[PDB]
Design a protein around this ligand. Structure first.
Ligand code: NAG
Ligand code: NAG
Lengths: 385, 372
């Protein structure tokens, strides 16, 4: 449809799969980065390999994804526009946030690559495709890969490929790693951050650095679902963080069952949300998770790429090229830093007068979105900040 | 006449000043980033203030001086790419009570990332200090912390210049992890220090300057837009004479294509984590830029307020040099090299180094390594 709708539906499909396998843990991933890793594959994919991707990853009627347009890969700025526009906007140097994307296919050097796919994927994608010797020097190849990621991510994402996840037999490895740091519009003051208990369960607490401010924020109270949603804008008005906080320390299970694109949209509508002065408590958070994309996508219906049945004819003519490993790694730190702070006097008066709070001191969901398109950039479950 | 020559000459005039005040230390700074901060200032400076900068920095000379010569390279090096990363946090913070000329703001926005940011120094200088240090820290993925120390800002601060940069790049030719091991680095000929010494054999441009009693090695980064030059004196203690002599003219000579030749060579180079911060005020003042820091400043292109001056100017540079690269030697080739290659470049005592931009010949970073 549109990139907003497509990333969100994709996001909740992945979430359904991951919540299976990661109960009572933090979850954090970047749907947009995953989409762009797969777009790259999609480009050279054919037949059933291609149709599986399209159905799962929602590529269908996005602007810039048709086979007619794709055919023009080398020579047209329209190809994959809908996705490339967001990546381009978020990866550009700027003064209020930083994204680092390290996303690449590593292909065994013995397989011959179509000159006109290398060119295509280089035009549209950064990282693209890189040839490498798995056949005679896997642990070397693994070191190369790891050290490219660590370099492109400012040393943050280390040992993306674990030992003996490549070997002489590896054909092609997908690597997709992302770091984000942004400033709030309204900073929390460091002096206001305090140790407070985070209630993981009813019967269990862990002390965390809890940030605090009073400010004018958009909030919705969904009494029917027993929850509240807060929106915290990032500086320069192109992204925001939504935090979905169940009333009860263990209301998460329910929310996770019901949440979907339609529900998120309903809950965050103009209609429902209103700007109020509120006391905000939010943990400082350092989210980092790494997922095996093979297991995930394969439960979702993408199977051919990872096997003998792969048709990647648009990439190599070499019959046996498939995806051997596919990893996603996402890192974000959430802390005080922002552009503006309220005067003290103001806050003292506020303190006195404001009674409503949003106290995120128990598990919550969060989503970072691009405002304009409603694209989901990051989605997570915070159980242990 | 070009950004290459201006950047080089600027670089070595700074070096002449830092080398006095920073004896026996590591030195490391990014001349291009300093020049672009000064360009942001220059734009609103008038009169003597402006002239002082132009003399020292050698702007009038340059194509676009909008600022094409300088902007072209900044834009190229800051764009995302798959071989290197440069994070620039460069910004003027001006006390929020000073009205900023619309002309200026529009124009800095359009030429310079970061540009100019109003802030409250007058009644909340401690808070303002936190917000400034938090912005650098946020923008450098946590790498440069604490750019301003307690009491560097007060109710009398007008404008603070903040110019921070982080670099990380892949070599064309990777060193292997397994080849790095501790070797003695001769700080002096009485004092050794265990460092992680990287090792490889490969084909590199090298110049041996008998006259000068030094060798020059060039190590390309992947996709050859940038190289590091290592300038290694013969004698453990020959660094003093070299730093005495080096300047634009000399560097150009020593690295001409007459002079440099590609040989197969054993390279030993320390893993390096370079990070330094400088008070730009003391530097600049000694070079001849005094007005901008003073009562007499004329920055009337920025603001009408007459107390506008730069109160604090800090440069911070961080670069990690390690084994990471794009391509490694094959075992077969490695076998041959080991049998054939005898000559070495062993960077096991203090050396100068330069990272340059290949097409414009501009200096990106300049350093002295005494202590890896
Ligand atoms: C990824 O998951 C698949 C299971 O679908 C498994 O075959 C493969 O070993 C996994 N890779 C790693 C790194 O565990
Ligand atoms: C920087 O040096 C200037 C000029 O010598 C000095 O007045 C100022 O105190 C120094 N700044 C800091 C932060 O030390």
């Amino acid at each position: 449809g549109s990139i907003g709708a497509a990333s969100m539906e994709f996001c909740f499909d992945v979430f359904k799969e991951l919540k299976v396998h990661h109960a009572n843990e933090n979850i954090f991933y970047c749907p947009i980065a995953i989409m762009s890793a797969l777009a790259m594959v999609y480009l050279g994919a054919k037949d059933s390999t291609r149709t599986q991707i399209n159905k799962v990853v929602r590529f269908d009627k996005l602007p810039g994804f048709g086979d007619s347009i794709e055919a023009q890969c080398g020579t047209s700025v329209n190809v994959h526009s809908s996705l490339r526009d967001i990546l381009n906007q978020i990866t550009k140097p700027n003064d209020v946030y930083s994204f680092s994307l390290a996303s690449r296919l590593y292909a065994e050097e013995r397989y011959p690559i179509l000159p006109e796919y290398l060119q295509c994927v280089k035009e549209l994608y950064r990282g693209g495709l890189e040839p490498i010797n798995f056949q005679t020097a896997a642990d070397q190849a693994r070191e190369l890969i790891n050290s490219w990621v660590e370099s492109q991510t400012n040393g943050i994402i280390r040992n993306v490929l674990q030992p003996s996840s490549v070997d002489s037999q590896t054909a092609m490895v997908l690597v997709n790693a992302i770091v984000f740091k942004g400033l709030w519009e309204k900073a929390f003051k460091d002096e206001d951050t305090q140790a407070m208990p985070f209630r993981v369960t009813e019967q269990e607490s862990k002390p965390v650095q809890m940030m605090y401010q009073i400010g004018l924020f958009r909030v919705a109270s969904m009494a029917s679902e027993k929850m509240k949603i807060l929106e915290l804008p990032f500086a320069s008005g192109t992204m925001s963080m939504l935090v979905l906080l169940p009333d009860e320390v263990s209301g998460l299970e329910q929310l996770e069952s019901i949440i979907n694109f339609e529900k998120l949209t309903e809950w965050t509508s103009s209609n429902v949300m209103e700007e109020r002065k509120i006391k905000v408590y939010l943990p400082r958070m350092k989210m980092e998770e790494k997922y095996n994309l093979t297991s995930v996508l394969m439960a979702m219906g993408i199977t051919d790429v990872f096997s003998s049945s792969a048709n990647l004819s648009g990439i190599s003519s070499a019959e046996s090229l498939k995806i051997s490993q596919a990893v996603h790694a996402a890192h974000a730190e959430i802390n005080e830093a922002g552009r503006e702070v309220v005067g003290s006097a103001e806050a003292g008066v506020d303190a006195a007068s404001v009674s409503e709070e949003f106290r995120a001191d128990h598990p919550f969901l969060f989503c970072i979105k691009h405002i304009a398109t409603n694209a989901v950039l990051f989605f997570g479950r915070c159980v242990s900040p």
